[PDB]
Every structure is written in C-alpha cells, then in structure tokens.
Design a protein around this ligand. Structure first.
Ligand SMILES: Cc1cc2nc3c(=O)[nH]c(=O)nc-3n(C[C@H](O)[C@H](O)[C@H](O)COP(=O)(O)OP(=O)(O)OC[C@H]3O[C@@H](n4cnc5c(N)ncnc54)[C@H](O)[C@@H]3O)c2cc1C
Ligand SMILES: Cc1cc2nc3c(=O)[nH]c(=O)nc-3n(C[C@H](O)[C@H](O)[C@H](O)COP(=O)(O)OP(=O)(O)OC[C@H]3O[C@@H](n4cnc5c(N)ncnc54)[C@H](O)[C@@H]3O)c2cc1C
Ligand code: SF4
Ligand code: SF4
Ligand code: SF4
Ligand code: SF4
Ligand code: SF4
Ligand code: SF4
Ligand code: SF4
Ligand code: SF4
Ligand code: SF4
Ligand code: SF4
Ligand code: SF4
Ligand code: SF4
Ligand SMILES: [Fe+3]
Lengths: 652, 652
C-alpha cells in the first residue's frame, strides 16, 4: 500500500513557534511525496491535538503520522497510544524533534532554525515512508519487586509493596539497613530522634512476611527487561556464622587491627571484626577482610566458634518484575576547597561528622569536642553551601538540606550548651517547606543563633591554640569580618554515593548534570526512569530531605506496582532477526551480542544464524556488523536509515 | 487474676537520667502493690531493653508492663509489639511520660522532677492494674477509591490507582480538570508548557476504564470509616447534555451576556455558556444560570440539541474504601498589604494574573500589558514573599514556589521582549531542588534578570501616568532605591482553597498552623492523615510545586492502595459499649456522638442503648456524659481514670 502521511507541527505555545516558523514548516511539509495532510497546532499532545490526529487518520485514511514537536523520550508513547486508538499501528508513527534539538538551541537564528525544522520533518517523512507495522510484544510480569538500597527511601518502598501483598526483595550493601538517617542524631523541623523513629520501620522491614531482606549484599548482575528481570545477588561473607551469632561483641577486643569507622565518618575507630551501630538491623557482626590479617586471635576468644574464614559468598538468583533504585548519597569531600582547610586543620569538620559527634551513640558519647585538644567549643561557625552552588568544584546545584540541618544542629548545641555562641555564614536561607521558615525564625528568636550573610573567603588556623578564624564579608554591612572560633563546621553538600557508577552500569540508567540518577521526566514522571520497570527513590535521584525521600519511596512503590498489578506489559519489537535465505552462517554476529541472542544453527541441511527474539534488547549492533545484510533490526533497518540520510539533503 | 507488674525506667542516655534519678524511681516503683519487677535501663526502646521486657514477661509471668520513658505518641506501637511478641496483650501495657513531660521541662529542678517521675509511674501503675485485654476489630475494605480534586495531584492519584486496576472515582469542583497548572503558561525549571505535562494526563484520566470522572461535581457527605465509606456526590447542573454535546462552541459566539472569567482571574470575559479554557477536559460547555438571561440564542445554533434548562442536580451514592484529598490551593489576596496598592493601582498585579496574561490562550492573547492603558511594560518589578513570611497577614511560612515562578516568568518576558528591564525584589532566593539553582544562575547570566535584596516598603502610583514606584532598601549597598516601573508584579503566596473548610468538616481531618491539611507525621507518613483511610496529595497539604505534587499523588495512590490490596483492615478497640444490665434507656448518649454510633433499641421487651462498634472512633464523650455509668470506653473507663487520679497522691 502507498504511504499517506499526516504531518503535525507543534508550536508548544511559543516554545517552538517563537523561534521556528511553524506555519511555514507546515507549508513545506505538504510539498513532500505522500504527505496528504499537514497541520500546525499550539499543543499537539493536548486533547484537541490528539483528537485532530485521530479524526484525520480516519477521514484522510492515513497510514503514517509525523509529529514535529518535543523529544520522543517525552511523548513518543503518548502519540503511539493516540494513533493506535485511531487504528494506526504505533510503529507507523515518527517523531521529529524540533524543540530540544532546534527551537530551544537556535533561539537567535530563527530563519536557520526554520530551515533546520524543515529538514528534520523531511528526514522523518523519509523514514516514515519505509516504516512497517510491528506487534508490541506482550510479556508477563513476575510478581516480585527488587529494592536496591536499605535507607528510609528503600525501606518505605519495600514496606508499601509488601503491605500491598507483593513479594519484595530488599538488598542492602552495608551490614545494616537505616542509611544516613541512622547516622543522624535528630531530624528537622520537628527535632525528632532520627533512629528513635527509623528503628520501628527497620524492624518492620526485617520481619515483614512479604519482604526478603538481604543485608551485607550487593546486586552484581541484572539481565532481562521489564517484568522479566533475572537478578544475581551476592550475599557477601561476614566470616561469622549468621545463625550462631549472638551479637555480644567479645571477639573484637583481641583484634590488633584498627580500621576507621565508616559509620562515624572517620572519627571513630573500629576493628576488622565489628558492628556498624547499636540499633543495627539485623543485629550481627562482620569481619572486614580488606583489613583482616587472619591472625586468628578473635577465634580463640569466640565461644561459639561462629568465626569461619572458609565462609564463601553465596550468589542468589532471583526473578523480579520491577526494580527500585534507592542507593542514596554521600557527603561531599571538602578537602578540594583548600582555603577552608579541611584535612589540614584539626578543628574544621563536616556537618555529617558533627552529627556523629552529637549523636549519643557516637564516638565522643554525644559530646561536641575539638579534635585537637578534646575541649568543648565555646564559639562555633557554620559555613553554608560547602560543595554546592560552586562551579570551582563542579557542583552548580543546591544540596537542599544544608540550610536546615545547620540551623537544627545549632539548636541542639544550644540545648546542650546555652553559653555556646553560634554564627551561620550563608548566602540564602532555604527554609522552603512546612514548618521550615518557622524553624528558621525559631533558631534566631528562641535559640539566639546568629546569621551572617556572606560566603566565607577562607579559614585560618592559629597554630598556637588550634582556633580558627573565618574571613568573610558581612554583605549586609559592607564590612569584612575576621571572627575567631573554637570549631568550624562545614555544611557539606550531597553527592552521588560511590557505588552509583556500578549500579548505573547494572541497571542501564542515566545521570543528570548534578551526577544523580535521571528521572524519566521531572514532572510527568518523577520516580520513573527511561528504562522500563526501573524506578528511583530518595537522594540517589537528587538532594532532598527525609519526608521527600519517604514520599518518593511511596511513589516508587505505586509506579512499580502498576506492572505487577497488571501482570502484563507491552515491550518494543525493535529486535533483530536473520533472513535465512541470505545468511551463509559466517558467525560474525554471535559474539557481538552481550546477551547471546544470535546463535548458529542447522536449517534445511546447512548452517545459518538465528536470533532468539526474547534475548534481543534491540541495540542494532549485530545487524550493523553483519556483512551479508541478512540481519536487520526492525524499525532501524539500513534502508530506513539510508532514506533518513537522503532526507536531510533531498526528498526521497 | 491478680496484677503482676513490670516497671521499666528509661534513662534515654542522659535525657531522662541527667535530670530524673532513675535508679531512685525504680526503687520507689517496687514499693507499689503488684509490682513484681522494676528495672532501669539506658535505652528501653533498644533491642536489649525490648528483650529485657520480653524475657521478664515470661520468667516472672507478668500480665501488666509499665514503661516510664518518653511519649506514647512516639513509641506506644513499639512497646505494644514488644509485649505482644512475648504473649502479653498490647492493651495491658501502660506508658508513663517522664521525658517530654518531666526531665526536659524540669532540668533545673532535679529533686522535684524525680518526685514528679515517681508520681507519674504511680499514676501509670494505678491505671495498669485495672487495664483489660482488648482485641482489634477487623473490617472489610470496599475495592474502590475516591479522589477529591482534579488538579495534577488528584489526576496522578487516579491514574496510578486505575492503572493498578482499582475502581477509582475522581470528583472535580469546576467544569474541567487541570487545576492551577492548567492556568500556567510554562512550568519551571524545564520551561515546558504546563499543557506539555498536564494535558496528556487530563486526556488519559477522562478515558480511563477504571476511573469515573465526575466534573462540575462536589462531595457533599461522607459517612462511615476506613474501608466502609458511604459517599454522596452532587452532580451539579451544567444545563447541557454532556453525551450529546460536541464542544464546538457555536453557542459561545451567539450568547449576548458577558461574565468575568474565573479561570482568567477576572482579567478575561467569558459568556454565560462556556468552556473554562480551550484545552478543557471534558471538552464540554456549561451554562452559568447566575448570569444566563434564558434568551435561547445558544440553543438555535446547537446541532445535537444539547441545551436543557430543565436540568436538575443528581445525588450519586457511592461506596469507597479509601479517600484522597487533593483540592489544591488558592492564591493569596494582597489587598491587605495596603502599601503595595493591589486593588487600588491598575498596574499592580498578582503573579497568577500575570500567568494568564502571558499564556497564549489567555485574555490578552499572551501579551503582557498594563491594565490602565493596554501598553506593553518596558520596566517590570517583581516583589517576592507577598503574603508569605509575614506575621502582619498571619502567614509566617514560605509559599515554596514564588522565587522560582518569578524567575521563570521573567525569562518568559525576556524571550518575548528582550528590551524589557526586570528587577526582582527579594530576601532569599529559594532555588532548592534539582535544576533550580541552575535555573536561578541562568535567569541572571543568560537573560540578564536583575535581583535586589530588599523587601519593598511600599509601592506608589503616579496618578497621571499609571507608573509605579517601588520604595525599597538595596540591603547589599545600604542605600534606599526608588525605581520607577511600568508594571509591578506581586509574587503572591499560597493559601488553602476556599472550599477547604467544607472538605475538612466532611472528611474529619485537621489543619496545621499554616491552615493547610495536616499529615499523620511529617517525616514518616507525609501523605496519610490521622483519620484512617483518608490521605492527602498536592498543595492542600502544603505549598509545593508540580514535581512534588505529582510525587505526592503517586505516594497517596500507594498508601491508599494498601488497605484496598489487603481487603481487610483493623481498628483500635478503645471504643464505647453499653452494659445492658445497667442502661435504663435514658437517651442522653444518642445525640452526643457526631457519628451516630449510640442508638436506642428494644431488647427482651425493654429499651436499652447499644453502640454500633464500627461507627465509634473512641473519643469517650458519651461514656463521660452517661449518668448511669452503663456506657464505658474501653481503655479509658471511669474507674481506670479514677485510680489514675488517686495515683498522683497515693498508692491504689
Ligand atoms: C549532615 C546531614 C544532616 C541531615 N539532616 C537531616 C534532617 O535533620 N532531617 C531530614 O529530613 N533530612 C536530613 N538530611 C538528609 C537525609 O540524610 C536524607 O534525606 C536521607 O539519608 C535519604 O535517605 P535515602 O534512603 O534516600 O538515602 P540513604 O539514607 O543514604 O540510604 C541509602 C542506603 O542504600 C545503601 N546502598 C548504597 N549503595 C548501595 C548499593 N550499591 N547496593 C545496595 N545498597 C546500597 C546505603 O548503605 C544506605 O543504607 C541530612 C543530610 C546530611 C548530609
Ligand atoms: C503564579 C504561580 C505560578 C506557579 N508556577 C509554577 C511552576 O512554574 N512550576 C511548578 O512546578 N509549580 C508552580 N506553581 C505551583 C503549582 O501551581 C502547584 O504545585 C500545582 O497547581 C499543584 O496542583 P494541585 O493538584 O496540588 O492543586 P490545584 O492545582 O490547585 O488543583 C486543585 C483541584 O481541585 C479542585 N477542587 C478544589 N476544591 C474542590 C472540592 N471541594 N471538590 C472537588 N474538587 C475541588 C480544583 O478545582 C482544582 O482542579 C505556581 C503557583 C502559582 C500560584
Ligand atoms: S562472633 Fe562470637 S563473641 Fe563475637 S559477637 Fe558473635 S557470638 Fe559474640
Ligand atoms: S583474624 Fe582478623 S578479625 Fe580476627 S583478630 Fe586477627 S585481624 Fe582481627
Ligand atoms: S540548602 Fe542551603 S546551605 Fe545547602 S546548598 Fe542550598 S543554600 Fe546552600
Ligand atoms: S553476521 Fe549475518 S551472515 Fe554472518 S552468521 Fe550472522 S546473520 Fe549470518
Ligand atoms: S540487535 Fe543483535 S547485538 Fe543487539 S541485543 Fe539484539 S541480538 Fe543482541
Ligand atoms: S524508650 Fe523513649 S526515652 Fe527511652 S531511649 Fe527510647 S526514645 Fe529515649
Ligand atoms: S509537550 Fe510536545 S506535543 Fe505537547 S505542547 Fe509541548 S512540544 Fe507540543
Ligand atoms: S453549540 Fe452545542 S454541541 Fe456546540 S459546544 Fe455549544 S452546547 Fe456543545
Ligand atoms: S440562553 Fe443563556 S447561555 Fe444561551 S445565549 Fe442566552 S444567556 Fe447565553
Ligand atoms: S519561595 Fe521565595 S518568594 Fe516564595 S515565600 Fe519563599 S522566599 Fe518568599
Ligand atoms: S446515656 Fe447511659 S443510661 Fe442513658 S441510654 Fe445511654 S447508655 Fe443508657
Ligand atoms: S465514645 Fe465518642 S465516638 Fe464512641 S460512640 Fe461515644 S461519642 Fe461516639
Ligand atoms: Fe526510642
């Protein structure tokens, strides 16, 4: 049948129309072969736009639709549903990106943007002509979810999913769940005890009938696609019998190797054999082989003889339908900001270190003290925006929680020591949510915490006393201050967790300019990722506080429960297949597929290749590498791409 | 059975122990009748403390436990589970608040705080003896949800729930869904059209097989409890047949009466027969009988003969298991801040009015013009924090979105008119989320938008030109500015929607100090309300942007789907019941219950009262008002409270 194309040019208000002469693109579109209808409209995704496309498909008997608008990554599915509702196969629809790829990047070159939009429409029309109707692959959904990361976000997702009756697996890297919230002393704006409100949830998750918690474990491989993921979990060896482990802690005294306690941010000192924190769930010990010397002194003291160095990590194979990534974040390392002297001056600390110092169960026994002499500081300075809103360190974003935790900890220090003078050096106080501005008002009126508007230039240590001097301009007075302090606290920003690189490669997700994981759309889909069946929850998606993280955990559980509840999802048939009449079995394609989909086989007495459709993810590498042309990826066939290339220069 | 009590005194590190002599309280506790065990421990809510109680319950065959520590509002559930795990009924457990209520408020009066702690332990022990074992009530959950409010939040909740396969009802007050987002032109920080994200969602929700949309309707009554709500929806009369209506609008051209358009904030003029905005869903028309003259001119042009002036509102009865409140918000009315002259000066407008002015489909055709002469403003001033962070107007909170929308609309005005000079008068720029600080950086570096740190003192109009003068201190220079402008935009804050009062009374939910709806807990239950089966989503819970509102919509869908998925929920048994042998049917209790649980009935030839257990929420008002003592609230019986009162002065 002959192509009958409908070209729709969107103005997107003035986002496109303001730069691209949309009516002119529409007139040009009509001059192309097979383009029987062409219209321009203010909002193509809106109800009148979709109804326009639909009505035209029926009235003008179109078999190809071209939408010249935003990015397919945003609305390709929207328009596929719109055309499918009118009876047109969704793979006979072609998107032409003239907004993100044209109007938004060529704002001061309108005539050239208009010319570029015409070529992109022509390139789309060129591919559209040779597109073919494909059947969306209906696949089943394994009734099981996987949550990676055991913090407040991941815990919330697994609790909601388990409460809905869905089998859920929760994988936690460290020996205990709880995340950074377990390291905090109290939480703003209520000043609630962090662990005192988090432990009940850690307990609920550990004994939930629908949640399988795998602590001290890591996801090492994820294969498959939405509804059919095959996941490999490595249950790391603690080198201590899990069942015979009482969790008393008497084998650590003998250990001669001291390791800096990660939980205490490097202030505290733990042993090779240890426990992360007192309220840890599950309550069990672990041997760190990265620092263990295998002297066996701990084994001589250990009664049960739970210690076993011949313990081997177990690889667990599990099948899940959806995956929620909630690996959280790490605190920025301020050593780079050399003028603040972190790592040089003893009394300059990060706010996360301060949290561990304030926390009752911390290394200093809940006592805020100077690391140089052990004395309690009488004067303290908080420096805001450390590692945030700073191009020199590559973090041009706001870490969201630093203004609030700085004011919070200042209140906690005042409650414990009212005579302590506290000054906060800031640019903007961001107390933007419920009770936050009130919390800010309170810090000053009730606790007498002082605020200086001015980002400090440098910190200088007095080598005689260990005291620090903060150099900064009081911008509200137009004068330079040089105030002395007993302790300087750096309000460090949030950065992606160290393992984020590994987790990205395993799930196949992307990152935003801030290096955190990328959501499908900031407003249309805040917890979904462009990768179907993979969602996000918490700080790994971007800097945010506890409630925002808990809300995302719940949101991710809802989004992740949709495929599980439906029990069936539709996946793209943009897969590779071998033309047996052309394949002479050269074997080049076999090793190119990382999923082993193409395989050599005997057919009609000779050897040919055959793609196992289910294992093909649709990359297009093997057809590109096929020297006979027998292999072709549906929707990205060489001929289709060839016509698309011709389209940039001429009509074909 | 004789009470066997176990009293546990917590030190909470030194939070209690540092003020209250805990070992002394423990000694005193042992002198009370029925106390078999009494122990003091550093952290009772920790694993060792919980195991200590569980072990003692079994080893000393205890039937009552008293924990003298923090507030039951924090750990009552924790200790309930702890004792229930040891076999002790959770209602035989009694909390004594000696931290929030004693050690934390009597820090400088240790002796008296110790004496007070002893009395509180004695008061608890006194009630404990007469406590009884109670069993939770199991009720079924109607597999249906109700979403009130058709904004982006409510739409998101309805879509997720419907996508999960749950029958959902979406009630929208105005003739179209979309909310305030529908009124915006673009949305920060992506500068997408509001329609980009919202319209496809409006489209989907209107044709969702599991969602019943009731536009131009209001919930007028809600009765029952979680899983068993009986709701009444009033389908208001549009005076047009929706099934017959095409939504062409030939009628709008013929109608001779002009009504101010609410959607355009009074800056637009609509007709008696109308469609809120061009992209409205349902794409149907409505007749405002408040202004219609009944000339019947619109009926002459309507082909399908849809106009019916004899239309009567229909009351729909529906049964739902859960309810999600997403009624949104209203823009603050700045008339009160008389110094800014809103409602006096023609060229002083609110940012929401500006949104309608700058929207292509708005009254001015997307042209920002002065309302005094129709001329385009060459100089514009944005005043931040209007109606927020201000005690004089009673709004001491941050409205969250004003810094961002002010910078967004300034970018939009510059794209349309680069020669326009824009100055933003602010205190703090709150660009706190992903891409926000970047958006802020961009407004200044790319668009040349200027920022003045100074909350303006007043605006003064030139009566001859209509131009405004902004009086403010440039705090970063310590000088007073008196700059002239062609248009002043007031960045109005968010306040609860007008109907919030009516909805609050229907659902039985509370409000936080900012007048927005109150969440169960800020940190851990951000979308649940203290009223079981009633959840929140969006701006009605507090000022927030679209990304957060969509996330809450999804979060609410997850939380609201838990009871629906379980199909069974439990209810606290701290309810009222009548002792038939004592009740002589005096009828005093009946009218005291706002839920109508106590009812008069005939039993064995005589009249007696009978509480319908499921309708009792457990307030204790009718038993308190019962003159025969036949009515009692389990867990708060008069005798139980009497002993508690005696306990303050002596041992019972
Ligand atoms: C100094 C400071 C003070 C703060 N104060 C407050 C406050 O007072 N109130 C407030 O609301 N918020 C506060 N915040 C923000 C708060 O810490 C976060 O909102 C919270 O930690 C986010 O929880 P999360 O689960 O998203 O991430 P996380 O808490 O970091 O949890 C992530 C979890 O996943 C695990 N994990 C990491 N990588 C992997 C992997 N590859 N595989 C498996 N598991 C993995 C981690 O070990 C961790 O347990 C503060 C932040 C800082 C830095
Ligand atoms: C001037 C301005 C500019 C803004 N710009 C941005 C921006 O650029 N980006 C951004 O992210 N955010 C922005 N915001 C914030 C944004 O408007 C909100 O986040 C968003 O509208 C939240 O939608 P909602 O569903 O929570 O409430 P709403 O949008 O207010 O929707 C509430 C819905 O419920 C309905 N309703 C009300 N009462 C009842 C009842 N009794 N029964 C039934 N239905 C009822 C209403 O008719 C309405 O449809 C801006 C706000 C303002 C004021
Ligand atoms: S290894 Fe043995 S001594 Fe060490 S905590 Fe476990 S049970 Fe106790
Ligand atoms: S064998 Fe390893 S864990 Fe045990 S005492 Fe020696 S160094 Fe410590
Ligand atoms: S939340 Fe506050 S301290 Fe933190 S990056 Fe933003 S402005 Fe800076
Ligand atoms: S690369 Fe092509 S010709 Fe070679 S075996 Fe594979 S499909 Fe056949
Ligand atoms: S196109 Fe080829 S290389 Fe790519 S996933 Fe498919 S079978 Fe593998
Ligand atoms: S039981 Fe209450 S008072 Fe005691 S340690 Fe726990 S939170 Fe603190
Ligand atoms: S989202 Fe895409 S189709 Fe919709 S108005 Fe914007 S550019 Fe147009
Ligand atoms: S003329 Fe009739 S069909 Fe057309 S929009 Fe008006 S009421 Fe609806
Ligand atoms: S009958 Fe009513 S709706 Fe129709 S034209 Fe007259 S005033 Fe307008
Ligand atoms: S978001 Fe900005 S303009 Fe709005 S109340 Fe807060 S500080 Fe003021
Ligand atoms: S108030 Fe008491 S005595 Fe009177 S009818 Fe009710 S239960 Fe009976
Ligand atoms: S105790 Fe309260 S809720 Fe219960 S039946 Fe009596 S008045 Fe109603
Ligand atoms: Fe506690």
């Amino acid at each position: 049948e002959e192509p009958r194309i409908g070209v729709y040019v969107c103005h997107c208000g003035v986002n496109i129309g303001g730069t691209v002469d949309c009516p002119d693109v529409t007139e040009f579109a009509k001059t192309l072969k097979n383009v029987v209808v062409a219209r321009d409209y203010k909002y193509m995704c809106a109800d009148p736009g979709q109804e326009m496309i639909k009505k035209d498909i029926k009235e003008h008997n179109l078999n190809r639709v071209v939408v010249a608008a935003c990015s397919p990554r945003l609305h390709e599915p929207t328009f596929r549903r719109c055309v499918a509702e009118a009876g047109l196969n969704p793979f006979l629809f072609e998107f032409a990106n003239i907004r993100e790829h044209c109007s938004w990047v060529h704002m001061h070159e309108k005539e050239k943007a208009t010319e570029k939009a015409k070529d992109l429409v022509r390139m789309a029309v060129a591919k559209a002509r040779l597109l073919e109707p494909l059947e969306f692959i209906k696949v089943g959904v394994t009734q099981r979810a996987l949550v990676i990361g055991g913090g407040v976000a991941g815990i919330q997702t697994a609790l909601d999913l388990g409460d809905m009756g869905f089998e859920t697996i929760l994988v936690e890297k460290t020996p205990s769940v709880g995340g950074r919230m377990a390291q905090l002393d109290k939480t703003f704006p209520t000043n609630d005890c962090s662990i005192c409100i988090l432990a009940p949830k850690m307990v609920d998750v550990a004994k939930h009938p629908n949640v399988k918690l795998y602590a001290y474990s890591e996801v090492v491989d994820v294969q498959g696609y939405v509804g059919n993921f095959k996941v490999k979990i490595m249950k790391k060896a603690r080198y201590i019998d899990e069942t015979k482990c009482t969790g008393c802690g008497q084998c650590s005294e003998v250990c001669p190797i001291d390791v800096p306690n990660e939980f205490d941010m490097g202030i505290g000192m733990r042993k090779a054999i240890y426990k992360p924190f007192p309220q840890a769930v599950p309550a069990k010990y672990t041997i760190d082989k990265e620092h263990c010397i295998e002297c066996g002194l701990c084994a001589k003291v250990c009664g049960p003889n739970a210690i076993d160095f011949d313990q081997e990590p177990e690889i667990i194979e599990a099948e899940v339908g959806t995956i929620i990534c909630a690996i959280g974040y790490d605190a920025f390392d301020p050593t780079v900001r050399e003028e603040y002297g972190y790592g040089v001056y003893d009394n300059v600390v990060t706010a996360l270190e301060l949290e561990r110092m304030i926390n009752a169960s911390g290394p200093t026994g809940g006592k805020v003290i100077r690391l140089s002499d052990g004395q309690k500081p009488k004067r303290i300075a908080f420096i805001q925006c450390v590692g945030s809103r700073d191009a020199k360190v590559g973090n041009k974003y706001c870490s969201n929680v630093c203004c609030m935790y700085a004011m919070k900890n200042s209140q906690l220090i005042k409650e414990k020591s009212p005579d302590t003078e506290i000054d906060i050096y800031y640019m903007d106080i961001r107390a933007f949510s419920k009770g936050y501005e009130e919390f800010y008002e309170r810090s000053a009126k009730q606790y007498g915490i002082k605020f200086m508007r001015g980002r400090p230039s440098q910190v200088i240590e007095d080598p005689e006393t260990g005291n620090l001097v903060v150099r900064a301009e009081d911008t509200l007075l137009g004068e330079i201050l040089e105030k002395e302090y007993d302790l300087v606290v750096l309000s460090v920003g949030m950065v992606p967790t160290k393992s984020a690189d590994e987790v990205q490669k395993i799930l196949g997700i992307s990152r935003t300019p801030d290096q955190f994981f990328m959501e499908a759309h900031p407003k249309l889909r805040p917890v979904d990722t462009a990768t179907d069946g993979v969602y996000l929850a918490g700080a790994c998606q971007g800097p945010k506080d506890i409630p925002a993280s808990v809300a995302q955990g719940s949101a991710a559980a809802s989004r992740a429960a949709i495929p599980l509840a439906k029990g069936e999802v539709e996946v793209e048939p943009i897969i590779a297949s071998v033309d047996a009449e052309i394949c002479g079995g050269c074997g080049v394609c076999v090793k190119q597929c990382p999923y082993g989909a193409p395989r050599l086989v005997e057919k009609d007495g000779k050897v040919v290749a055959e793609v196992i459709s289910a294992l093909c993810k649709g990359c297009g590498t093997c057809p590109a590498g096929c020297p006979s042309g027998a292999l072709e990826q549906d929707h990205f066939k060489t001929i289709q791409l060839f016509k698309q290339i011709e389209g940039m220069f001429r009509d074909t």
